Ligand binder design. Structure first.
Ligand code: HEM
Length: 121
């Protein structure tokens, strides 16, 4: 495997403004190439709140996610999202539940990479 950091901002549906979702992911993320496949690797903070997350490209194709690491003590989760070189955006659909505070919501957002996913040597 090889990798590079990549900056990103999650933005609110229909807007270029920062989404609250951006505040619950670590930055920067990473691009990884392994076995000729590309992934965006990112860390979800307060992972227990993220009851469902789905990623899509701009064409609305599904992007497979896998769990790389679950840090239960820190409540973080590292995931890989399948991507291709040239991707600039991802659409996300998330179900966020924090029961203590009566928070159970479904959102759409768009994750904007600083620069398009690169080809890696
Ligand atoms: C994993 C944790 C959380 C995630 C991923 C998340 C994500 C989001 C998203 C995607 C929206 C829709 C508008 C946008 O994209 O910004 C939103 C709205 C909102 N959520 Fe959350 N949220 C989280 C935790 C919280 C917490 C802890 C609170 C505490 C009350 C909260 C209260 C709110 C409020 C007040 C809004 C609308 C306010 C505004 O538009 O600025 N959420 N959130």
């Amino acid at each position: 495997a090889t990798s590079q950091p990549i900056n990103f901002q999650v933005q609110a549906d229909g807007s270029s403004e920062k989404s609250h979702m951006d505040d619950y992911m670590q930055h920067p993320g990473k691009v990884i190439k392994q076995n000729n496949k590309y992934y965006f690797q990112t860390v979800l903070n307060n992972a227990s709140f993220w009851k469902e997350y789905k990623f899509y490209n701009a064409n609305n194709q599904e992007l497979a996610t896998t769990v790389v690491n679950d840090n239960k003590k820190a409540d973080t989760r590292t995931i890989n999202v399948a991507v291709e070189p040239g991707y600039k955006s991802l659409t996300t659909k998330v179900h966020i539940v924090v029961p203590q505070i009566n928070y159970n919501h479904r959102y759409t957002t768009h994750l904007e990479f600083e620069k398009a996913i690169p080809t890696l040597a």
